[model samples]
Target chain A: WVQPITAQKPSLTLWLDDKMFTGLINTGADVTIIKLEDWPPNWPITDTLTNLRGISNNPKQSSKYLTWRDKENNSGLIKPFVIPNLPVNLWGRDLLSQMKIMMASP
Target chain B: WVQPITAQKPSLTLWLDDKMFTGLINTGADVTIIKLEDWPPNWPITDTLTNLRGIGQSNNPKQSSKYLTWRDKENNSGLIKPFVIPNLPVNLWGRDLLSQMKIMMASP
Candidate 1:
């Protein structure tokens, strides 16, 4: 289940392992991503991504991959590229595509 | 009601006056924004926003705000403020935009 945060920039509540995570459902993003600092300390960094650029066009941001699962029993091993100092998290389409899900209009 | 487009980057469909618009649900944004070209010709520009920066840190984006009606799949409607930016690569449904309307979106 997901709920909108209702603010200047809209976000949704995505439950990962029963943890409430607030993030945007970005269609423009190529992958699901969270702030680098938001990653759990116990989760091991699986890999790194380079030359990642977006609206900001900042010098390539480095990121890692983590295994994620939802409350509905949907599971995905995805690489959510991390951006340094990102204000919020993004639930990218890659993960959604893999999960065979789509966002219905609200 | 909400559904994801299920692509490389996740986007949700937002209906404005029966028109289908695709956009990202962004929490880091200050306003709901769309490509300037996406705006209907008849709606007059209400205001301008300068020096608005995002993750990209692009300088001085060309943007304006407009009043419009937004609808969901369930046929619920609300007045929404969506900013128009020229040459934006994609559309963004900002937190501030939804906050004004107090929209609560739930996934299917």
Candidate 2:
């Protein structure tokens, strides 16, 4: 009796150091991850790159973290872990848990 | 004012045609998908094979559908539209039920 019409993925634009980035809402992911190529030149690397695994446990992947600055005019700071060689930026539940919002499907 | 920490994936058991199956709560997926090898011989296939596109948007993936009569551990019953895909790593329960069930996640 309780089900939405569909389970489509949601997309949104986020800011990193005043730059706009495209991200996908991924609830399955445990941590927010940005692509290596997306890392800005000016941003300082806070941590060393390391290996991480996901649903596809085939092989462990490499990851790191960066201090994220929301470009929304002093929206404050956030640090999201990042992965290298990913095709797209993933906005995982880690970030969602920090925001005040609801997930409603139409 | 409204946000839950650690959107960890939850695991649960559900019944399909009187049989037990394991599934993962996947908000990223658009629909529930079961592995082709797991499809029971008694259940009837409701749809033909078709291609699907996911977050990776890689090569089109093939899938089919099956009408599912499921029950939670609490014995709650409902019907579901699940897809059958070859080489599915694991069973997934999509966000289709989130609004209807009003589910929330919490972490310490």
Candidate 3:
């Protein structure tokens, strides 16, 4: 009788390095990525090493490998990359597999 | 029998432009991606002018792209656009296919 909250983009309130964010459970990503802006200026970033093919060669730099936590405080390891401006934080296979994900149904 | 229907990384055999392909139902991708090698050399690929991030960096990664009809084994089909790239490690079934299929997220 009523419209329910659609799960088009299932998201959760996630914590990384103590910072809270609205992250997506995205399997499309082989790796997880964080927006450069969202990153604290105090954090250090290494060389840009990976090339993503959507744009021609979107460069990605490896950041400090950290753990992802939920409100429960349970956590898992995540090797995240940094992009100059990632609009949304994506939790991909690398990160999700460590924790878990029960995806959408057909 | 405690066998669960937990289909991790849901995948399916699909036909793109009538050619067979193994594809992953990806939620992380904002757009569909295809292997440059898988794409028929004869197929038409136009340069993508717009940036794809969600909308990323100062500059977007523009790639060669093409639109094709993707069909399931039973002939259920839809026209989907994908970025054809050399570094694409896998076939991503993104919103292009989601927009055409009945799959949706289920959660508490």
Stretches of candidate 1 above 4 Å error?
A2-5, A8-28, A39-55, A58-65, A71-74, A97-106, B1-5, B8-30, B40-43, B46-53, B58-66, B71-76, B95-108
Question: DockQ: which candidate is best?
Answer: 1
- TM-score, candidate 1, is 0.58
**Best to worst by lDDT, what's the order?**
3, 1, 2
Q: Write the per-residue lDDT of candidate 2 for residues B39-85, one digit (tens) a residue.
A: 77666655444444432332433333455667766666677767666
How would you encode candidate 1's per-residue C-alpha lDDT over B2-30 as one tens digit per residue?
A: 44455544455767665789887654466
Question: Where does model 3 exceed 4 Å of error?
Answer: A1-10, A43-65, A71-74, B1-11, B41-49, B53-68, B83-87, B105-108
Poorest 10 consecutive residues by lDDT, candidate 2 chain B: B55-64
Task: Assess candidate 1 and give its lDDT.
Answer: 0.59
True contacts kept of each: 0.55, 0.26, 0.23
Candidate 2 vs 3: which has more DockQ: 2
- Give per-residue lDDT, candidate 3, residue A61: 54
**Tens-digit lDDT string for candidate 2 (A28-72):** 666666776886756555553443444232222222333343334
Give me the chain B TM-score of candidate 2. Answer: 0.70
The per-model DockQ list reads 0.37, 0.25, 0.22
Which rank order by TM-score, best down to worst? 3, 1, 2
